[PDB]
Amino acid sequence: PVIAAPSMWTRPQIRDFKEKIRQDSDSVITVGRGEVVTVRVPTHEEGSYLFWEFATDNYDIGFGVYFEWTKPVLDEIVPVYRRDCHEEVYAGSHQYPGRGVYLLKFDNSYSLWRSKSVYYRVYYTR
């Protein structure tokens, strides 16, 4: 196989983003102290791309992305790194390498005392 590079960008309107997100309660995750939440996003049949947006309250969080081919095979789309997504909205896109499941890693494992509040959206498009 061969993998396309992802595209990632930030945008300034964090309060608005969070308010919009908060109009749905299943779009808000609490990542415990020292814990890692994995969001599994299967590839849509009607789409060729994954799109993600996310933000946090008052503290950074590690974010990264893997692709699980459908024991299994994993490719590293985005490396896990701490992002200041408490200050800006973080977002990105990746072209489907094929049929499979995307793994969004929200990684709080380095945080002893602080939970993290994660606001996120995932999309597909052609």
Binding site: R11, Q13, G47, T125
Partner: peptide, 28 residues
């Protein structure tokens, strides 16, 4: 170790508007 399953939603012209507004790139 928690694992959530999300079904992605079709990206819309509206969604895409906001996302693009005052966008700044990023590298890793």
């Amino acid at each position: 170790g928690l694992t959530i399953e999300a079904e992605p939603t079709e990206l819309s012209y509206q969604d895409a508007l906001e996302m693009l507004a005052e966008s700044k790139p990023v590298s890793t």
